[PDB]
Amino acid sequence: MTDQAFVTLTTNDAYAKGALVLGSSLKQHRTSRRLAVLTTPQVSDTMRKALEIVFDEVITVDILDSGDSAHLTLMKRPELGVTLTKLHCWSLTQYSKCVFMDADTLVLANIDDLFEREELSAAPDPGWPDCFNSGVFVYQPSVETYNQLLHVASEQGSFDGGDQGLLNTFFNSWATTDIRKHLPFIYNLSSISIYSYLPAFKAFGANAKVVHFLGQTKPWNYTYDTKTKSVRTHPQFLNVWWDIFTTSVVPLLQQF
Amino acid sequence: MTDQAFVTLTTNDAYAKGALVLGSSLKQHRTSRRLAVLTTPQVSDTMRKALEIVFDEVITVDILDSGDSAHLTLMKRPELGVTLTKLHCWSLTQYSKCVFMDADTLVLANIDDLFEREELSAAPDPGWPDCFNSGVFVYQPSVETYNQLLHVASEQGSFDGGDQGLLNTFFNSWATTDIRKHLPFIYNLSSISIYSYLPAFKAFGANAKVVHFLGQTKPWNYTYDTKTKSVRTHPQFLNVWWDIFTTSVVPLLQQF
Ligand SMILES: O=c1ccn([C@@H]2O[C@H](COP(=O)(O)OP(=O)(O)O)[C@@H](O)[C@H]2O)c(=O)[nH]1
Ligand SMILES: O=c1ccn([C@@H]2O[C@H](COP(=O)(O)OP(=O)(O)O)[C@@H](O)[C@H]2O)c(=O)[nH]1
Ligand SMILES: [Cl-]
Ligand SMILES: [Mn+2]
Ligand SMILES: [Mn+2]
């Protein structure tokens, strides 16, 4: 499918590492879809070159440029900078349907069946499960939707200072409407829950399709021993991320 | 409705305090339904007498008695003692439909609209939101369902050593089937989430219909200053619980 894509985002080199691991994981599990990444000019040439290899499309978004439609909203609401760059995922009208995935996600199994879903399909957020987590969602690119999202960001901002609040407010029927728009939690399995509700993880965690490295500490904030093949609680997913980073991404960075 | 009920559970005097506050809160918000409480012989005469006043029906369940259908399962799986007592909520076939509520819940608004729901309707659990939280659920009493639940408890036990695992395993279509069986989170608002995902709470918490005092520390494990009318983070709900306990329940205990 040349008209459907996974779309991720990186505004810097650190999240580009995640993007590269995510992209690699999607290729590893043989996606039949395109891979697109929103980037900013702050992503360095080296990360960019690697992103150009891993991804089928590298889109450059610069909301610091006043030529960008979101720039005036960034001025008004700096807290929404990442959110606003993220919203440009809706501008990818070369694609008919996309799965947005946070750059701190990791694919463990083919998830092309997400493309059966409609906008807006997303997994519940742990913590407040009547909100969906915006780290993984199925959406339909549309300039109108983009404009409407931008408009809401401008007018209301986001109840949580990020995209999740914004997306939940805009797609507010999610909690009460259409169970098919609730992506199984295994398609956006928060790394925290992989020890928060541990019995549930024991019971259902082996079904994980997507791990989402929530919280302050991202996989690249860890040190990884390449000999023992383990990072420096429950490091299983961290080690998968780092195995991909070590195996696929680091050498890729070295050929550029 | 004489055939529909809120059903709670207390196996001891401490949770009887919760039961009494819950029951009082349900009366406070003018439920048109019956109030039933499952109790064990371990609930003391004083708590019982108060329970007999607050609740329309006090049911005594004794799974330590070998005459109980669950007793043999308790022997096999002691971890399920509370769960097994709880399952007897399905034996309440005097009622056509019930809302089970944990004794550590607190009603903040009329929730009689829960009786529009079918078995099994429950709110998502924070932590693993493809499980429902079993602190509040709409169910239909049935000896068959009771027997089937008991059978599963006997054969598999519970993936989390409690009722939640058991109920989720038995009612396992919940996550993927019928959005109407997802009770809004506000009908079972985990006290933890009232600081875990705090922006969401700020945004939606004022809509709270039911507060669920999750975690080790229950409202009765707090000290409450009756003069300042506050307990000894975000004590709002604790103070509501204690206002009811102080105002309604304590004097009630004193008249028995
Ligand atoms: O400084 C940042 C912050 C986030 N992001 C992107 O926006 C998403 C926001 O999710 P993040 O993982 O940062 O937040 P969390 O999921 O931990 O709550 C990331 O995955 C990245 O794709 C980015 O590129 N640069
Ligand atoms: O020792 C106990 C433990 C629990 N329960 C009942 O079973 C429910 C189990 O939920 P609990 O609040 O204890 O667990 P949590 O919701 O905190 O995970 C309680 O609300 C009570 O109704 C009880 O009566 N005695
Ligand atoms: Cl539905
Ligand atoms: Mn993320
Ligand atoms: Mn409880």
Tab-separated table of N, CA and C in Angstrom, chain A residues 4 9 44 50 94 99 135 157 177 182 186:
chain	number	residue	atom	x	y	z
A	4	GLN	N	-0.824	4.255	2.211
A	4	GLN	CA	-0.938	4.163	3.658
A	4	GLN	C	0.433	4.127	4.284
A	9	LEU	N	7.588	11.008	14.304
A	9	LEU	CA	7.973	12.394	14.457
A	9	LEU	C	9.261	12.436	15.242
A	44	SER	N	19.874	16.589	12.930
A	44	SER	CA	21.165	16.755	12.247
A	44	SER	C	21.286	15.928	10.969
A	50	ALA	N	20.348	8.816	7.957
A	50	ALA	CA	19.819	7.538	8.448
A	50	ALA	C	18.293	7.474	8.345
A	94	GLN	N	-0.726	12.799	0.844
A	94	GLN	CA	-0.233	11.769	-0.075
A	94	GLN	C	-0.669	10.389	0.414
A	99	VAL	N	-0.977	5.433	10.464
A	99	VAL	CA	-0.862	5.177	11.867
A	99	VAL	C	0.206	6.118	12.372
A	135	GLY	N	0.155	8.288	21.511
A	135	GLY	CA	1.428	7.770	21.036
A	135	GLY	C	1.269	6.887	19.819
A	157	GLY	N	-5.968	25.703	23.274
A	157	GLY	CA	-4.753	24.998	23.649
A	157	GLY	C	-5.101	23.563	24.001
A	177	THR	N	-17.764	6.015	22.239
A	177	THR	CA	-18.239	5.716	20.889
A	177	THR	C	-17.327	4.797	20.102
A	182	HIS	N	-11.232	1.843	19.902
A	182	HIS	CA	-10.332	1.528	21.006
A	182	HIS	C	-9.357	0.492	20.492
A	186	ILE	N	-2.347	-3.591	23.760
A	186	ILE	CA	-1.129	-4.202	23.212
A	186	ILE	C	-0.540	-3.499	21.977
